[PDB]
Each structure stands twice: as C-alpha cells, then as structure tokens.
Assembly symmetry: C2
Homo-oligomer: 157 residues x 2
C-alpha cells in the first residue's frame, strides 16, 4: 500500500485559541460555502450537532477535478491539543483506490499572539492506483487556512 | 512563507541495510537514469566523490512538467539514522518561488528482514508563488522507491 501525507503550515498573527475556535466550530460547514465559493458549492449536515460523529455531505464547485462529492465524518475534535480529524466515509477518494482519506487540522501555539495552522492530508492508497497519489498536492487545504484566518483577522478589525 | 512537505512510504521485504546501501551509494545518479529514463534524462556529477558536498546536475525527460533542470547537493548522508538529504542549489524549483527545496530519503528498519522507504519532499515557498505548492504531489519520488526496491530485491 501507498501510505502518504501532505502537510502545509501557515503562520497567523492571532492567538491559537482564536483560530481553533473557528476550525472546531460547528458553523464551519457554512463558512466553507460562504467564504470559498470557488471550492465549496454545497455542504449538507446529515447527522450530529457539530461535535464528534457529525456527518457532512460535500459538493465541490463545478469544474474542480474529481472527486467532487463525498460524505465525511468528524472523528476527532481534541480541544487539549487543538486537533480536528475529518475522515471520508463514502464516495470521494474512497471510490478512487484510497482505503483511508483523512484531513487533520492542528493549531499550534507560536507565542501568545501568533499561531501556526498545520493542515495535513493523510491517506492509504491501493498500489494498483498509485498514480492517484498525484491528485493530492502540498497546497491542499491552504485556501481554507487562508479563508479562515482572514475571517478571524478582519472581524477583529 | 508556505512551509510544506509531501511524504510517501513503501514497505519493502528486505533489510533496511540493503536498501540504504543503494540510496546512499554514489552510484545512485547512474541508477536513476538507467532505471527511470522516462523521468531522468541526464544526471551529471559536477563536483565531489558521492559524499556530503557532492553536486549533481539533473535534466528530466521531455514531457515531464517544468522545472526540468537544476543543480542539487548532498547536504546530509547520515548512516546512523539512514537518512539522506538532497537540496536544490540552482535552478529547479528555486526559479518558481521556492526558497528551500529538499528531498529526504529515510530507510526505517521494521524488523530484521523488512523496512520502509520514506521519501519526503520538503520546501519553503514564497506566498507570491503559493499556488506553485500544487506542483508538489504526494506521489513525488514513489517511482524511485519502486525502481530501487526492485533493483535490490531482484539482485538478491
């Protein structure tokens, strides 16, 4: 099997708690559609109150390369460590040879007034489909870090 | 800056020493061209004997996306930890907003007869070129892992 991860890190000049408050917020499914229309077309909440166990249905914008639709589940929201794990559970990359497809957001304290958004995409991929690993790029989830940090910064202004 | 890395891991049923012996070998530049001509068209040794400080000039095969040419340098060959670090020093991704562009091969012993090839591509990228992060994909260097593992396995 192909075991793989991509990671990017964004430094943000606000405290970690202020960024984690939004990444962990159950309102995030709405903010993705609201703030990133070129990425997220429609997100439905299928089950749950926004805490662990919540299931979403994702539809990406027209013309974005496949996969554009899937169901995902919030499987970890660790407030201690400011780490959120979201796992695809139906469709999406699971129909393209991936046996596991996780996205992990970790908000790292840099100092009292700045933090790092670490966005990890981690997967296990059938070797018969190894070329699909090239669909996963080091820029994955950077746009979301940019949109969420911008939302927090400008609202403080 | 964009701080970023991609990593893939291949399990291989031979001892770590046998895989590290080839990844760390100064013959590796020749094996890349010999075994993967669809990727590496030409690799010249510009300076050095294969140890730390050795500089190579890479030309990728036609049809591979830009950037196709660069110079790189072996900046670490850690035999104790089985880790090799190769840094681009001219051209390559340095012409596309990347300020640091490293490739790291680490051979991880699992048990006496099996290991993991961990191939990491790690970079720092200017945010004016932040979209160029999408040029770096999770499959990077997987083909080299296939070629070297096969070379070691079949030769045993």
């Amino acid at each position: 099997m192909v075991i793989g991860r991509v990671v990017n890190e964004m430094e943000v000049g606000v405290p970690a708690d202020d960024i984690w408050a939004v990444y962990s917020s159950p309102e995030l499914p709405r903010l993705f559609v609201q703030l990133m229309p070129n990425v997220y077309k429609k997100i439905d909440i299928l089950q749950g109150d926004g805490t662990v166990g919540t299931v979403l249905h994702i539809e990406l914008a027209d013309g974005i390369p496949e996969p554009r639709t899937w169901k995902e589940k919030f499987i970890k929201i660790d407030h201690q460590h400011r780490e959120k794990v979201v796992r695809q559970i139906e469709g999406g990359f699971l129909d393209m040879g991936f046996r596991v497809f996780d996205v992990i957001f970790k908000i790292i304290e840099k100092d009292a007034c700045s933090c790092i958004i670490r966005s990890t995409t981690a997967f296990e991929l059938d070797e018969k489909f190894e070329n699909n690993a090239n669909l996963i790029t080091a820029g994955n989830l950077w746009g979301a870090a940019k949109a969420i940090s911008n939302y927090v910064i400008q609202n403080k202004s």
